[PDB]
């Protein structure tokens, strides 16, 4: 799992969340992660589809 | 050409734009002016909808 | 000749450079920018950029102004900045003192995404607490004074000694050369262009068939500018955490 | 002041009116329009419209020209039309004789979508076979001579007596009135606007806060024109089967 990666300096996780909407009440929104070590590397899924 | 920033016959269009922009994000907590306490937000209605965004896709 | 950059064309031309915004934020901007522009009394207001944060709530930053005037050999734009975290409600991004500017310049890393957070610095042991919005404003100021790119001779001076669009601008003769572009704060007719900048801090890719030039900053990686010569439009955008690239000498 | 309509802004502003194009066709246009414009030697070439067909292969129609001149009190544009069914390869849309113009005017219904098809007409019993591309070109000619909308005083006459963009155009003073717009083929300074058209054949909706006016044709439902006054852009598009609305008196 990506959770067991090398943390960045300061007990910081190496992957940061990204969301599709600013409100937690929209019912069909995407989710994903962005890489801190390699800026520009993104993974993300919406519903049944996903991509890196 | 020399016109104002926005005509005076535009309050309806401005109200429309404010209503449309209020759709996005969460509503800001408003407070009671005389009291100073925040106004209790409305409890949301329970409903079922489709995925309008996927249909747009 | 355009009168103001168009966010649709900007997002269309600079999408290949990875400078993109969310779909919800795109719609929300389409509604929110005119509202704020009117209720602030500004003549121009555009999307300046988007700074990434650690909790996923990136800061959208917008920049507006009313009129630009020539003062002391510089084209000064009395700009005002606003920030947002959803694209719908814009808050003020207030200026920062000069003394605090140094401290926030010392703070590095990706921003937290919590406007109420404040970082700590230690000096001779006096500790200062710097609000996050101060750091954000300072990074925006640095990136702005570094890039602020427009085409050369696209502005002009009028009778009241104000900088106004040159509506008879014909276009850049050689769009693939850095001489065709300049900083915003350089007076018209001053002959100072991007070629007077430190050699190697700008890259230019020009598609001579479609007529679209892309100018990328290498000193602040994340600042992109586009110029379309067949339609005579242009515009820029910053997307990234806001930190300067200090290792540039080793990377060229 | 724009120099030529931008397809991105057109598709962005007229999408609310249902005037849309497929995504693949949008990309294909972004590539194909410059190629054809260059290899035909034309100064201007834009997307004119999109006519729906019975087999799902709608005709995209593009219109281009080189220079417009004042002849006999009319601003004549020597236009040339091209058609396509995928957005990538443009073929010629050749003019039609006057005698055949009447026959193709008599043919109604949604087009077939097969450029090799030909319809049949019967007269005194002499039968004529009219190719489908003839019907297409005449519907385009009718819609073009009916609408062809531009803002008023956006063009001007030059020394060689040619119609050129008025680069000092300041904008329409009253964008919600039909006097602000005119036909393309009306000479500058002639005072003929859309208000001289048959009363009730045009509708205007003006968003006074954002500054975007939409002019819809009611005689040819499907022709939309937009004018953005804060950025001084404009442009039109036709989307539909191409038939005139003859029941207009009963529908108003």
From TrEMBL, chains C, D:
Keywords: Cell projection, Cilium, Cilium biogenesis/degradation, Cytoplasm, Cytoskeleton, Flagellum
Homology family: Belongs to the flagellar radial spoke RSP9 family.
BP terms from Gene Ontology: axoneme assembly; cilium movement involved in cell motility; motile cilium assembly
UniProt KW Cytoplasm keyword: yes
Tree of life domain: Eukaryota
Origin species: Chlamydomonas reinhardtii
InterPro entries (alphabetical): RSP9 (IPR055316)
Annotated protein name in UniProt: Radial spoke head protein 9 homolog
One GO CC annotation: axoneme
Localization terms from the record: Cell projection, Kinocilium; Cytoplasm, Cytoskeleton, Flagellum axoneme
Disulfide bond positions: 104-138
Main localization, broad class: other
Annotated Basic and acidic residues bias: 117-124
